[PDB]
Amino acid sequence: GQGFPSFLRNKIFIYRGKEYERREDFSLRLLTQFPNAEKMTSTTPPGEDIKSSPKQYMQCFTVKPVMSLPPSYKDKPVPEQILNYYRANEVQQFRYSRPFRKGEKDPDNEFATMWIERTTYTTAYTFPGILKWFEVKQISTEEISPLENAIETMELTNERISNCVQQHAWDRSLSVHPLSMLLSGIVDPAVMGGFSNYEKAFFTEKYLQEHPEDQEKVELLKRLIALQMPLLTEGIRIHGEKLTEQLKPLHERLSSCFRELKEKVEKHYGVITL
Amino acid sequence: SRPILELKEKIQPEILELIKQQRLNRLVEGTCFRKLNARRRQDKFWYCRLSPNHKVLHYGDLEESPQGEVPHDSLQDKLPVADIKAVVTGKDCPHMKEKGALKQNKEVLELAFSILYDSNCQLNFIAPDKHEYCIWTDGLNALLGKDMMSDLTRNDLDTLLSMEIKLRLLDLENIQIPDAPPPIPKEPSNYDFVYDCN
Amino acid sequence: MQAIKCVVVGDGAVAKTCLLISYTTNAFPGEYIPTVFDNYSANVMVDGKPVNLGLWDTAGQEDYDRLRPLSYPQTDVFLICFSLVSPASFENVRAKWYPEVRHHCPNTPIILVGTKLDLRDDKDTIEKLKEKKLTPITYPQGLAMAKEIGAVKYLECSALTQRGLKTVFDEAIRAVL
Structure with missing residues (x-):
């Protein structure tokens, strides 16, 4: 907009919100701060007219606090607490994901089009600071192939499963419900099968014609799921440690489908487990 | 009081907006x-x-x-x-x-x-x-x-409008207002003010 | 620190998963990213203390009626869902979903939730329903079905706007709380 004061007009800021402020809670709280409380909808790109137009325009959206590097920590088995502190505090980089359709809109499949224009944000000063907010200092975008999309989704999946594994491997009086959460969601991609989606999209020779030279990534995905599988094994056994009679039908289904996918990766996927 | 009443109600809005801003203050408090x-x-x-x-x-x-x-x-x-x-x-x-x-x-x-x-x-x-x-x-x-829907609001309208018009009729004391406005003397079209402006 | 179990069922023609994932992602409307797995979770503060939770994304196929009830036991609350603009969804809920659910877990607070609230008054969607002889069925009869069950609450929300969505989840959490 232009009604903004000089230092505010056409400026992008990042706000260290509260512990659990929803995007719209903070949005409304800012609406309190301002008259002409309106939001455009073109959330990602700017608005050229409103770069010069009056009638101050605003937009809010959570960004991803890009993980910092705790120096000298890069490999030691340091417990999570240190990192979860570093997870959000002492940060300067901020990425923002961007959906996009790039490919044919095949009905059963969304990943034939999935390309992500993650927008990275680098501010001047590292949160937390003397001010609960700061302008962006440099902004940049990204581009993510469905190959990559699968790669990093698979990754974060793996480390999340790890995370639950050790947190319940360290604490005993701990809810089994998250184990149910995870083991369910991973075991049956019931609403839609992500694994078969990988197979139809990438493992298919058709992808090897669309991206012949870019087959060096489907092998990466195979390695990813291969490394997953023993983690699934420890998840299964952790459940067995936390198994209850209610979970027993649950556990048997989990275990049965677990060795099902075991053999699927070993031979049906033909990927080599370690 | 026919010219009086016409002039009175005809300069209305100031009292109305004053009442409304007072209501605004009341809502805020x-x-x-x-x-x-x-x-x-x-x-x-x-x-x-x-x-x-x-x-x-x-x-x-x-x-x-x-x-x-x-x-x-x-x-x-x-x-x-x-x-x-x-x-x-x-x-x-x-x-x-x-x-x-x-x-x-x-x-x-x-x-x-x-x-x-x-x-x-x-x-x-x-x-x-x-x-x-x-x-x-x-x-x-x-x-x-x-418009407003407080009887007290109409009360305020009438009373303050009456006060204001009453405090204006001081100049016109011992004087009468021709209900027909006084005829306008013909202003000579020349604006060459013999005396200087301001 | 505590967690809450929460189930969501419904036909696959309404894509409630989109709503759930959009909420948990805190994402912009029409900007969510579809994952490969189900049964999402989040940690939420509603009052006093933040609480963990997880949302069993249960596929609505008739056949998975063998596996879905196994998830039912010891779920703090369940969320029955539908499409406000699908009379067939109404038929399924009043006829299949509601009956068998109330059968399975007769002792748990329940909230009914609308969907496609923007599409409820969507004139083009309404005229398509009329020319297809379907009804853009509105609130008061949804309230009627809520009374029919006496659900602890009924709400209508939308995904493209997330209106009431936060309220939907807050009512869901404070159903226990």
């Missing part, structure tokens, strides 16, 4: 409003404060505060001012038509006022008595920018 059927350990009193920007309303299930409004983040500090269809007053309130446990008795017939928003959410509120009930309705229609 607000008070602890009254809920519905606050019997079984329910806070009948709870403050509803308007923003100094007069665009959001600080209200919610606040406690039984006899001091009145406490300045803080009420249970909901937003009431969407830009989209309020209306406030229903009297029988138009669906909560008044309730025939179950939320039966409002006929003694709150003139304390029934429900803010219309979301096209399905209503705020069936109760006023402690008539004058402030009309005051809040007046404040809302002031946000709505239409």
Whole structure:
């Protein structure tokens, strides 16, 4: 907009919100701060007219606090607490994901089009600071192939499963419900099968014609799921440690489908487990 | 008093806008409003404060505060001012038509006022008595920018307009106003002021 | 620190998963990213303390009626869902979903939830329903079905706007709380 004061007009800021402020809670709280409380909808790109137009325009959206590097920590088995502190505090980089359709809109499949224009944000000063907010200092975008999309989704999946594994491997009086959460969601991609989606999209020779030279990534995905599988094994056994009679039908289904996918990766996927 | 009355009511708006801004101040300072059927350990009193920007309303299930409004983040500090269809007053309130446990008795017939928003959410509120009930309705229609519905508002209109016109008729003492305006002397078309301007 | 179990069922023609994932992602409207797995979770503060939770994304196929009830036991609340603009969804819920659910877990607070609230008054969607002889069925009869079960609450929300969505989840959490 232009009604903004000089230092505010056409400026992008990042706000260290509260512990659990929803995007719209903070949005409304800012609406309190301002008259002409309106939001455009073109959330990602700017608005050229409103770069010069009056009638101050605003937009809010959570960004991803890009993980910092705790120096000298890069490999030691340091417990999570240190990192979860570093997870959000002492940060300067901020990425923002961007959906996009790039490919044919095949009905059963969304990943034939999935390309992500993650927008990275680098501010001047590292949160937390003397001010609960700061302008962006440099902004940049990204581009993510469905190959990559699968790669990093698979990754974060793996480390999340790890995370639950050790947190319940360290604490005993701990809810089994998250184990149910995870083991369910991973075991049956019931609403839609992500694994078969990988197979139809990438493992298919058709992808090897669309991206012949870019087959060096489907092998990466195979390695990813291969490394997953023993983690699934420890998840299964952790459940067995936390198994209850209610979970027993649950556990048997989990275990049965677990060795099902075991053999699927070993031979049906033909990927080599370690 | 025919020219007097014409001149009097014809310079109207200043008193009206003064009344309305006073209503605005009253809404902002607000008070602890009254809920519905606050019997079984329910806070009948709870403050509803308007923003100094007069665009959001600080209200919610606040406690039984006899001091009145406490300045803080009420249970909901937003009431969407830009989209309020209306406030229903009297029988138009669906909560008044309730025939179950939320039966409002006929003694709150003139304390029934429900803010219309979301096209399905209503705020069936109760006023402690008539004058402030009309005051809040007046404040809302002031946000709505239409006429007022406080008898006291018409009282103020007449009394202050009378005061102002009365304090103007001092120059015209011992003088009469021709009901037909005095004839305009022909202004010579030349503007070559023999004497200098200013 | 505590967690809450929460199930969501419904036909696959309404894509409630989109709504759930959009909420948990805190994402912009129309900007969510579809994952490969189900049964999402989040940690939420509603009052006093933040609380963990997880949302069993249960596929609505008739056949998975063998596996879905196994998830039912010891779920703090369940969320029955539908499409406000699908009369067939209404038929399924009043006829299949609601009956068998109330059968399975007769002792748990329940909230009914609308969907496609924006599409409820979508004139083009309405005229398509009329020319297809379907009804853009509105609130009061949804309220009627809520009374029919006496659900602790009924709400209508939308994904493209997330209106009431936060309220939907807050009511869901404070159903226990």
